[PDB]
Amino acid sequence: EDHTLVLQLENYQEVVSQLPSRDGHRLQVWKLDDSYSYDDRVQIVRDLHSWDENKLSSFKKTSFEMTFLENQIEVSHIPNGLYYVRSIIQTDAVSYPAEFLFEMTDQTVEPLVIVAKKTDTMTTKVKLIKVDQDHNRLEGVGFKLVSVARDVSAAAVPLIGEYRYSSSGQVGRTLYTDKNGEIFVTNLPLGNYRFKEVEPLAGYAVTTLDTDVQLVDHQLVTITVVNQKLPRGNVDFMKVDGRTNTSLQGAMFKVMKEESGHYTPVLQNGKEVVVTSGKDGRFRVEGLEYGTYYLWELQAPTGYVQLTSPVSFTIGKDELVTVVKNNKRPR
CATH class of the missing domain: 2.60.40.10 (Immunoglobulins)
Structure with a gap:
């Protein structure tokens, strides 16, 4: 009359993790009358599989307290008897259906251990x-x-x-x-x-x-x-004074694309792409997918006014070097 049943489950840790509380669960059972034998468990379980209350009406419906321990469940204070189970766990989060019988007798070694196969998969x-x-x-x-x-x-x-x-x-x-x-x-x-x-x-x-x-x-x-x-393509640039067409060193730009109304940096070789006009005015962007981009001016050549908007350029299948003009600051 005081038996413990241990249930081991598939994917036990994860199922448990999904439980709101490890505490307060009950195992619903039916206690079978003496016309049933544990020797006949294969056929019994088959014969009760297709739900029908008319198959169960002779049995005593009861339940036992369960606890979810670390790698297994314990079901507590179970009297002697032959018991049918249809579900181990049934929650809004987690269902662990399982159809089996177990039997407690005065000869049952404590605890009884059942490895329950999940059903309804x-x-x-x-x-x-x-x-x-x-x-x-x-x-x-x-x-x-x-x-x-x-x-x-x-x-x-x-x-x-x-x-x-x-x-x-x-x-x-x-x-x-x-x-x-x-x-x-x-x-x-x-x-x-x-x-x-x-x-x-x-x-x-x-x-x-x-x-x-x-x-x-x-x-x-x-x-x-x-x-x-x-596909990918390249663009060569040259930064010049717009009046004289002579090259200008030190114009710095960040290369950007536009997304949803703002400029966002292009990333290449593990960083944002910044380019600086060289001693000869020259700079370049290479590789880089077909599309439309922008040279966002970070710093003007010494003595020059900032450009009034970024320089747009399009990479595509369709000048040998794109000239970017700068205006000398009058003051």
Whole structure:
């Protein structure tokens, strides 16, 4: 009449981590009548599998206190009997369904140890495939996943591991393509989702920021997102006095792109790109993807006025050296 049952679970540490409280849980059981034998456990468990209250109506429904210890659960103060379990844990965050029988007799060595197999394992599944325009797979591209309600990005989706929904998971994560270009997410609730390409790989331009996906059942949904690999080019500059066309040393610029109304620094060789007109007026930007850029003037040549706006330039397939003119400060 005072037995303890020890339950070991799949992915035990992580499941526990997802529990609000390790304390106050109960194990729901049915205590079987004497027409049932533990010798018949395979067939019993099969015969009770398809839920029907008419299969259970003769049994005594009860429950026992559980505790989640470090690597296993203990279930406390269990009388002698033959007991059926359908669920070990069932919460808003975590479900651990499990169908088995256990038997306590006066001969039972304490504790009884059962390694419980998780049941009800089908899950939603979505696979994102990231490619370039020739369908090479792209590794290391970052996405965030958001759910969608009536077209709006309703929430950042919580996740654990790599990558599985959990309603008590972390909402702040960027998901990154693997060596096969793939992101794989399981157990998302049914519904409408959007993968947002928040972190493109340099050299590959975003075609569509958002890629929508709808999970209506448990069948794999695969979506393919296409990036534009951009060629690279160079530009030679020469800083001169605009009246005399003689070269000027010491004009400093930061190279920038524009994004959403502000200038942001171009990064190359592990830093922001700064260029300085040389003894001959010359400077240069090399490599650097096709697109539109700006020379943001940090410092004018001695004796010269600051340019009134940054110098725009476009790198593209289409002068041998681009001349940048400076006006001598009258004063």
